[PDB]
């Protein structure tokens, strides 16, 4: 009861899913074969970890997850890798030909050939749920599958599950690790087509994660493996309230009430601390006040933008580990007297707090220090619109010359879809200005 189904789409979605599920197995004491010795109820139950794991009669704990890619090579590494026994083969879905960094191929030409099979496999997971809460969708903005197949899937899920919650984890493109010149086209097309179908979207700027890996973990040239381990810690903080019990534990749905004042304004800024090497953590214990203070440093944000130059509509603190409310409340009081935290005039200023007592876990061979306490701040700030403004500008430079547009038109798209998507983004940028203006 209260099951959540995860859907991992395309390379970024799949490799981030690998890192998240590895970490969840370590957090819950689940072995790579699916066995969980601490679980005394064989073949079922309604423990908090059953939101994300189903159970077979043979004691196997199976992710409530589908992995989809339009080419096989990334999902083939899950099929032959360390966690190969965790997943039933029917949860891992591949085509033969990818979307070639083209939204139009992911949504239409290649995507149409596999969408009915993917919905079939998702239906099989939904049918084993006694009270399905909703879906968590992991994808890139920049890839053809991450952009175009995800848009198609989100539209089809609105039809087949009506208003069931759909949450996204969306990888926003950075030039240091980008693979396509057309990523801005793909980003705007998928944001436009998905925006009415998504309840809440957590954007992860590859450039913010890349910089955190370089600056805080002293990684000279971060790989996807480095970025994904850090992303999995942030995802785990957000989903921890669904996967664990505790008196001070606050369900993600209750944070969502505070984070989404209007349906379109559904893009929270995540900030995570502490991100520290084993060599720096040694004999340096970071207190509740230190990790809380670090949530108001822009350098710890998942998206590059400056909240000191916008307005808050919501601030949520999701603590894990050795944290009591007394220390949180003193940390917040100190921060209020010292920082640039300006709320809109129509929103209350209180910070909403959750505490999960289970400390953070790290993956063996990882870059992050094992710490006693961590925090993820989810804020609704007008500053997140900066990320849209950057992408919209790159879109405008190329689109004014119709650069690369023939690749989309060749797959059956019209120019009208480009100008409609871009107009929706202009109206979104404008919505973020309007909600920040003072009431008359």
């Amino acid at each position: 009861m209260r099951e959540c189904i995860s859907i991992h789409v395309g390379q970024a979605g799949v490799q981030i899913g690998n890192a998240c599920w590895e970490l969840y197995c370590l957090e819950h004491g689940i072995q790579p074969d699916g066995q969980m010795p601490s679980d005394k109820t064989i073949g079922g139950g309604d423990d908090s970890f059953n939101t994300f794991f189903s159970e077979t009669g043979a004691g196997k704990h199976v992710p409530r997850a589908v992995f989809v890619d339009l080419e096989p090579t990334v999902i083939d590494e899950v099929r032959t890798g360390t966690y190969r026994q965790l997943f039933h083969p029917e949860q891992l879905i591949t085509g033969k030909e990818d979307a070639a960094n083209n939204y139009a191929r992911g949504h239409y030409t290649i995507g149409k050939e596999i969408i009915d099979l993917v919905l079939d496999r998702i239906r099989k997971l939904a049918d084993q749920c006694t009270g399905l809460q909703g879906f968590l969708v992991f994808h890139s903005f920049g890839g053809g599958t991450g952009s175009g197949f995800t848009s198609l899937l989100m539209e089809r899920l609105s039809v087949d599950y009506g208003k069931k919650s759909k949450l996204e984890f969306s990888i926003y493109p950075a030039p240091q690790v980008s693979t396509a010149v057309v990523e801005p086209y793909n980003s705007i097309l998928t944001t436009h087509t998905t925006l009415e179908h998504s309840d809440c979207a957590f954007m992860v700027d590859n450039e913010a994660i890349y910089d955190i890996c370089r600056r805080n973990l002293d990684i000279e040239r971060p790989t996807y493996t480095n970025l994904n381990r850090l992303i999995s810690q942030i995802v785990s903080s957000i989903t921890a309230s669904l996967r664990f019990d505790g008196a001070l534990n606050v369900d993600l749905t209750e944070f969502q009430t505070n984070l989404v004042p209007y349906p379109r304004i559904h893009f929270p800024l995540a900030t995570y601390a502490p991100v520290i090497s084993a060599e720096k953590a040694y004999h340096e214990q970071l207190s509740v006040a230190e990790i809380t203070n670090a949530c108001f440093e822009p350098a710890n944000q998942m998206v590059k933008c400056d909240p000191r130059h916008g307005k808050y509509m919501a601030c949520c603190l999701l603590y894990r580990g050795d944290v009591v409310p007394k220390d949180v409340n003193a940390a917040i009081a100190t921060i209020k007297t010292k920082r640039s935290i300006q709320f809109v005039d129509w929103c209350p200023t209180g910070f909403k707090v959750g505490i999960n007592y289970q400390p953070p876990t790290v993956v063996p061979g990882g870059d992050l220090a094992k710490v006693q306490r961590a925090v993820c701040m989810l804020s609704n700030t007008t500053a997140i619109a900066e990320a849209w403004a950057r992408l919209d500008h790159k879109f405008d430079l190329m689109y004014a010359k119709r650069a690369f547009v023939h690749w989309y038109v060749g797959e059956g798209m019209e120019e009208g879809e480009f100008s409609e998507a871009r107009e929706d983004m202009a109206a979104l940028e404008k919505d973020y200005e309007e909600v920040g203006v003072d009431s008359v």
Binding site: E155, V159, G162
Partner: protein, 50 residues
Amino acid sequence: KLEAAEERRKYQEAELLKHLAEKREHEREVIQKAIEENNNFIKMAKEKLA
């Protein structure tokens, strides 16, 4: 004078139960509006995609 009193009590009671009846009518209209908007969303997403 006792029957007249009783009839005023029965009148005030029938007035209350009429007002509570309009409330049940309104409750029935809120949930039907919720269903009709969910169905119209699904319908219009289905048609736009086709």
